[PDB]
Amino acid sequence: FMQDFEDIQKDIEQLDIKCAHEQMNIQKQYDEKKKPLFEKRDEIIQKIPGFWANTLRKHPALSDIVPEDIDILNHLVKLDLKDNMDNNGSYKITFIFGEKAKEFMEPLTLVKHVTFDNNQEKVVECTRIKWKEGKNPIAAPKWSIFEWFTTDELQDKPDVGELIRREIWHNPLSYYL
């Protein structure tokens, strides 16, 4: 009877396996249909002066970042989420900065690629920002958003990755307003 319950739950899980599979096939139908929309949206962001700067810091968890952060972020021309690469919650976020950001740093493309193992997070890739002399804002209650570009864990320090993926990326216009 302990055994009967296991038998029944085999049968249930087999149906969920097959349900999730079909749903995923549809899921990845539309993921692909979205790709164009996300790209046509990036083109609009390009035409909206300092959009990400004014978007990001309207999120409560990011609102109290150093003012210096804004100086660089004001040249964030492009932000992209590459979501759902693993079936495990994996993603890659990419910051592309206009030329003027060369006053403060190198390179102009920052990437951070992340996976998960046992609900512990692991950073697979991360750009080493090379701040110009006297231009590092991590050198200034507050923290610097660019502190998010480490390999180390972030204890009691906002997961800019997760907030982006789960709250901001789907509709950043909400936050711009």
Next chain:
Amino acid sequence: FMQDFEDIQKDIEQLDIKCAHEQMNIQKQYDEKKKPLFEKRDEIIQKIPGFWANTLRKHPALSDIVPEDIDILNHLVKLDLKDNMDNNGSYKITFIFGEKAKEFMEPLTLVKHVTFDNNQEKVVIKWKEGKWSIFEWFTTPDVGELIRREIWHNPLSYYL
């Protein structure tokens, strides 16, 4: 531009809506295949004295509950989740209690709906004389989700 942006989100949103619709439609086809299998599972539980009473509190979140909940939970004969009610993710949970629970309450079936609209949540017992509380969640620990997210799909996990 502010209109071009507002337009592309609707383009995205309704691609989202669709997707959710077709995915649901699939959920239902399997919710129906599974219905007989819940009947046997429920049929089986009835032959494991105090199954639910013993399954819930082995969940770390509920492990802090007051002894008197157990008294009632011991007379909980049937528990059912009815999930994904709408494109938002609304569910209905129903506790049916045996008749020895008359000692403690009316009515003996307790239904609870948590309803989500296109963004947020709107949510919706008379004790006899002497009778946190797990039933303290029957106001207006998110035990309703502890059940649906984690327990329901395979409760025997927690029994063992």
